[PDB]
Paper text:
Indeed, our (ultimately unsuccessful) attempts to disrupt the interface between the double ring serendipitously led to our identifying the MPEG1 L425K mutation as yielding a greatly improved sample and an improvement in global resolution to 2.4 Å (workflow described in detail in the methods). This mutation resulted in two different MPEG1L425K assemblies, one of which involved domain swapping between the two head-to-head coordinated rings. Three-dimensional classification experiments and multibody analysis of the head-to-head assembly reveal that one ring can adopt multiple positions relative to the other ring, that is, neither ring possesses a single well-defined orientation. In contrast to other MACPF/CDCs studied to date, the recombinant form of MPEG1 has pre-assembled into a soluble oligomer that exhibits the expected features of a prepore assembly. Within each subunit, both TMH-1 and -2 are folded as small helical bundles. A central feature of the assembly is a 64-stranded β-barrel that represents the top, preformed portion of the future pore. The majority of MACPF/CDC domain-mediated inter-subunit interactions are formed around the central lumen of the β-barrel. Around the outside of the assembly both the MABP domain and the L-domain also mediate extensive inter-subunit interactions. The L-domain forms substantial inter-subunit interactions in trans with an extraordinary elongated β-hairpin that extends from the MABP domain of the adjacent subunit (the MABP β-hairpin).
Numbering used by the authors:
A (entry chain C): 293 to 526, 535 to 630
B (entry chain CC), E (entry chain B), F (entry chain DD): 585 to 630
C (entry chain D): 293 to 351
D (entry chain D): 535 to 584
G (entry chain D): 177 to 234
H (entry chain D): 60 to 117
I (entry chain C): 10 to 176
J (entry chain B): 10 to 59
Amino acid sequence: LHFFINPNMLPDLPGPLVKKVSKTVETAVKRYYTFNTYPGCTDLNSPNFNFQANTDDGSCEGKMTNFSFGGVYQECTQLSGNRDVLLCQKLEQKNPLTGDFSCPSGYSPVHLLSQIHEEGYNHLECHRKCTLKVFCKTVCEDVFQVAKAEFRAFWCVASSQVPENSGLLFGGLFSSKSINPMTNAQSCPAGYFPLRLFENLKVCVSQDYELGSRFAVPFGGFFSCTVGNPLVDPPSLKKCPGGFSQHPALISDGCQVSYCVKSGLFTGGSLPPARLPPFTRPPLMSQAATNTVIVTNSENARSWIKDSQTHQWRLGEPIELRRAMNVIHG
Amino acid sequence: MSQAATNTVIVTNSENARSWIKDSQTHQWRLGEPIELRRAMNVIHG
Amino acid sequence: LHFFINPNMLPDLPGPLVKKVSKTVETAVKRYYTFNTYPGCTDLNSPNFNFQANTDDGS
Amino acid sequence: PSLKKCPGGFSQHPALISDGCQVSYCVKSGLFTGGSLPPARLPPFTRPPL
Amino acid sequence: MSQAATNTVIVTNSENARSWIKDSQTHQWRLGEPIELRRAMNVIHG
Amino acid sequence: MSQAATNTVIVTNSENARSWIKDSQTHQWRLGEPIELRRAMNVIHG
Amino acid sequence: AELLVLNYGTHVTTSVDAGAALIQEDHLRASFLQDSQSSRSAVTASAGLAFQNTVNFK
Amino acid sequence: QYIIPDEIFTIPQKQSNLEMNSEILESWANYQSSTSYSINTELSLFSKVNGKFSTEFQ
Amino acid sequence: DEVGVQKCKNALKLPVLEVLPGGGWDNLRNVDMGRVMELTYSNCRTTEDGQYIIPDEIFTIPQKQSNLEMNSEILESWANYQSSTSYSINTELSLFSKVNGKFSTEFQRMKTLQVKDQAITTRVQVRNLVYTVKINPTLELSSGFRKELLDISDRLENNQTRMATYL
Amino acid sequence: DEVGVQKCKNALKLPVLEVLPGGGWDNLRNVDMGRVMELTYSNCRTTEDG
Ligand SMILES: *[C@@H]1O[C@H](CO)[C@@H](O[C@@H]2O[C@H](CO)[C@@H](O)[C@H](O)[C@H]2NC(C)=O)[C@H](O)[C@H]1NC(C)=O
Ligand SMILES: *[C@@H]1O[C@H](CO)[C@@H](O)[C@H](O)[C@H]1NC(C)=O
């Protein structure tokens, strides 16, 4: 489609500007193929056959290595909008194994993804003024601002090779738009507590070893579009451990986070449809909205109003109610 | 007669800043301009 | 239905005000699916079979 | 906190709707379960205020 | 190719301030607006 | 009245150098010329 | 907003497929399928044979 | 052969399908609508509830 | 006066060729999209045998070719899949040549029969190619497609990258 | 007035020879390309058998 976006087809636009349009559509088409690519085992006779897989992964014989899930933790750093939202409170998660922003003694942190979160907060100011005991004026201003915050999500990996017990025996996820397949809902299984992640991920976690072993799945690792899991080489490869199956978590503003598992419940079913665009949302903008009301408290009181420089003088009414909405991009 | 006259001016100091204005309850929403200059004259008899 | 409530389809209204209309209809559609969801046991061979149930409860 | 699922073996059944929120209760009769399939609850689920 | 792109913005911070603009030698004199935003893109081959 | 008058001149010193100019937000993109000569006269009352 | 969903639904159809279809829908006892995976390909081709008899033979 | 509105384009795909077989649906959870299949199978939160109050499902 | 296709149909009294290029094409699902090129009927052009009205920017090649197989062809794996209706546009040389067509209904029906039933697939066909219908390389864009490229174009001017990526 | 091929078709009422030279030819794929020569129908010529 970007072949036909060239200076010949668009003669009423400048040269380097139709190459920005051609490059931003070439990126959108390439992003559409990437989000609909499912690598996995495609041989139906192999025991770890990945139904719902498009591309031959080249790993059809695994070794069945059980791994240790060292937990997740997420930092936050407020950038703007202090004392209004407290973004760094409902966006912060500590590791249950340490109670801290660190991995345990037998583990090591792996950085998944670092992005900026945005929320909006709201002021509302009103004052009233009267002139000559008639003609009461009330203006109601409502400002919408954007508060930003940086988050950095980390992840623990068994790098000391000698644990006593692994810890936190579950590896299934659900988003604000996804579903945990071990519950078929947006909930935890029996005796599981969620751990908050990037913006909406809640990773279900239990370290009970008796009531948690009914629902505990073999966990394989996380990887994203920028980092790979280090559970394949002994940088990284972002493939899979081997024998496990990639499954996607949510999309954090154009980047896809994926996790590996070896149930067989995650694999089968029916063939999914394609993920259609758009994969991002339009961003938040800072706004302003005013409401001026003029109230004439009396008869025998005329009023003339000229609304703008192009309007003509107009005979006024007892209640006016002007409105305005002001938006600034960025 | 005792009178009153107001002059409200809105100045947008920037591009990339749109504005919509609804002048009264009978008007429709209107795309705003960088300088507005509303005017009003209020008279009371006695 | 809220995909088609955007500033392009409604050019005679301001920008942030057609996003309030689009959000209050997205909430009404989502409320309609929630009130018609019946989790329960869907396996007909189980003794505690929930007829009149849509979603597999997993219990 | 809790799970708002069910105890297990019981069946969810809805009580009334308190202005957009749904209250549900669990029971294990078998009389509450069977019958015919209900139709959909159609909107509006609230009323205009006083 | 090596390029160049400019953006000149004129902001009138006041009413009671008129402005006339003649955009080029072929244009006629034109009554100015509070926000102007001229643009230019300059390309040189090699 | 206090006044102001500007004269911006763009001179392309070469061939093999194209230029596109968008004069205002209502204009369309226009193929540029080697000598441009924009003019502006700004008056403020009082 | 909720009366908009009563009157206009939850979705907007953006493409339709215009055509016709003739459908058979039998219900069989679940004990009849439990024989093997080779009985399945004979249950399945029997239902397609009964459907062609029903359209042709009066 | 048909008058169409101005904002609507049609694609001629004069396609006929004929099955000599059947298809077995031994559970109502994985339900195929047979007339509105592509709009029910969308990726969403409530993809398991789409079509579950249709007369053809019930 | 009278304009468009219907001026051509009244003067000539013969149908329009319903198989036209210049439209959009989703290459994952093998469905066709909105129209990217401009179709005009100003010059009342027909095919050279005089049986279809064609647009002005489109030339046709008469290759009245019939193929008949007395055999079949065996496809014992869904990886090397033949589309049978969009084969030449899926087999292009690219990075994602292995993903083209893998969400089509014709593929997803074939894959679920070789895995569920442990099966192999055969295909016999009688193909009857009548025309090759191409676009003249000096064609211009459609009215709707140009408008949506100009809206992306406006956002790149104003340094609005996230809103241009969305559009 | 009336120009082009259709002036010839109305006066003569007989088809046009659909196999014409002067087009482009990809010699690796054996497909034919866009038209390189100019095809004009000014003189209403027919084949000798008419
Ligand atoms: C339902 O199907 C079963 C097959 O699973 C039928 O049982 C067979 O019937 C034939 C016909 O007389 C007997 O020869 C077989 O011995 C039966 N059993 C098996 C295991 O094949 C059964 O008859 C059917 N139900 C009815 C009411 O006819
Ligand atoms: C566009 O805006 C981004 C926002 O930070 C800035 O980094 C960049 O330098 C801007 N570019 C131009 C050409 O104004």
